[PDB]
Amino acid sequence: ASGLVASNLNLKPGESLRVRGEVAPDAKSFVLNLGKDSNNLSLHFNPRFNAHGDANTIVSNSKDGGAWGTEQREAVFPFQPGSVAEVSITFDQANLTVKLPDGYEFKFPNRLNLEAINYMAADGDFKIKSVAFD
Amino acid sequence: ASGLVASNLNLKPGESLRVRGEVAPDAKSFVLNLGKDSNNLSLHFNPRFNAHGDANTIVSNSKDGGAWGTEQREAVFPFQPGSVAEVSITFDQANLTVKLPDGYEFKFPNRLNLEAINYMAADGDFKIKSVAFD
Numbered sequence: 001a002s003g004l005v006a007s008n009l010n011l012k013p014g015e016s017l018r019v020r021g022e023v024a025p026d027a028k029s030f031v032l033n034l035g036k037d038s039n040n041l042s043l044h045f046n047p048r049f050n051a052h053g054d055a056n057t058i059v060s061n062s063k064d065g066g067a068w069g070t071e072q073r074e075a076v077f078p079f080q081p082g083s084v085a086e087v088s089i090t091f092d093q094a095n096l097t098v099k100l101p102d103g104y105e106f107k108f109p110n111r112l113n114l115e116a117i118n119y120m121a122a123d124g125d126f127k128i129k130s131v132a133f134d
Numbered sequence: 135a136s137g138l139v140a141s142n143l144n145l146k147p148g149e150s151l152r153v154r155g156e157v158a159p160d161a162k163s164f165v166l167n168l169g170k171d172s173n174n175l176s177l178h179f180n181p182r183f184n185a186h187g188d189a190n191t192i193v194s195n196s197k198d199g200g201a202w203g204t205e206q207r208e209a210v211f212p213f214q215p216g217s218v219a220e221v222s223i224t225f226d227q228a229n230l231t232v233k234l235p236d237g238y239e240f241k242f243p244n245r246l247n248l249e250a251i252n253y254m255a256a257d258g259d260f261k262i263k264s265v266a267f268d
């Protein structure tokens with residue numbers, strides 16, 4: 001990926017990942033990917049400030065064998081350009097749980113039926129400051 | 135080895151990398167590698183409890199183009215199996231500065247003179263719990 005890439009994570013069901021970073025000042029959006037590898041993603045977390053027709057909307061999706069799944073969009077957008085963003089993601093067998101900066105939480109189905117998350121990657125618009133595992 | 139592996143870290147001169155991890159309860163030693171890739175390590179940080187003929191000794195080395203350099207041993211050992219340990223690493227063109235769990239810090243020559251440190255890898259005896267950039 002463009003930003004920080006972490007592998008061999010072996011994040012098991014019930015375990016979580018907390019990521020804090022800085023969103024590019026001139027970023028139309030940023031990405032945090034979680035999955036098995038670059039082509040198999042359980043969660044493509046993509047807050048869009050202004051991209052692909054989306055204005056301030058969180059878009060989430062899966063990627064199987066390189067093929068994008070069906071997108072999911074949220075009703076809140078607790079992110080501000082050129083600022084710090086902290087998200088926590090919990091992996092579980094049925095669903096991944098995402099907790100946002102405003103306290104809002106949502107779930108995304110574990111479509112790939114992964115037994116663990118071994119891959120994480122941020123793009124060029126999200127500069128990671130810290131990553132923690134509980 | 136089998137621990138967490140990170141790439142595209144983009145650690146720049148003067149920037150601090152804080153790594154906190156769990157030292158395996160049965161560990162005879164553990165490793166934290168930092169550099170460009172598996173064949174080019176600015177720092178092979180290897181605390182040894184009882185391994186390779188050494189006892190409770192911190193051994194550091196570099197690896198350039200695959201070749202191991204001259205090992206450096208520290209005069210203190212603030213580590214123990216089955217416990218959490220945090221180390222901080224910073225660097226300039228001349229040396230890398232490594233700060234240990236108790237506040238003790240030493241310098242290791244920057245033998246590879248990399249523009250930035252982009253790779254990190256822990257072995258099976260050091261379970262990384264957190265990585266932070268300052």
Ligand SMILES: OC[C@H]1O[C@@H](O[C@H]2[C@H](O)[C@@H](O)[C@H](O)O[C@@H]2CO)[C@H](O)[C@@H](O)[C@H]1O
Pocket residue numbers: 044046052059060061068069071
């Ligand atoms: O699904 C994530 C994926 O979206 C791509 O953009 C989509 C867009 O979201 C959708 O509204 C449109 O119909 O198709 C586009 C092409 O897939 C992004 O380009 C890609 O980066 C991902 O973010």
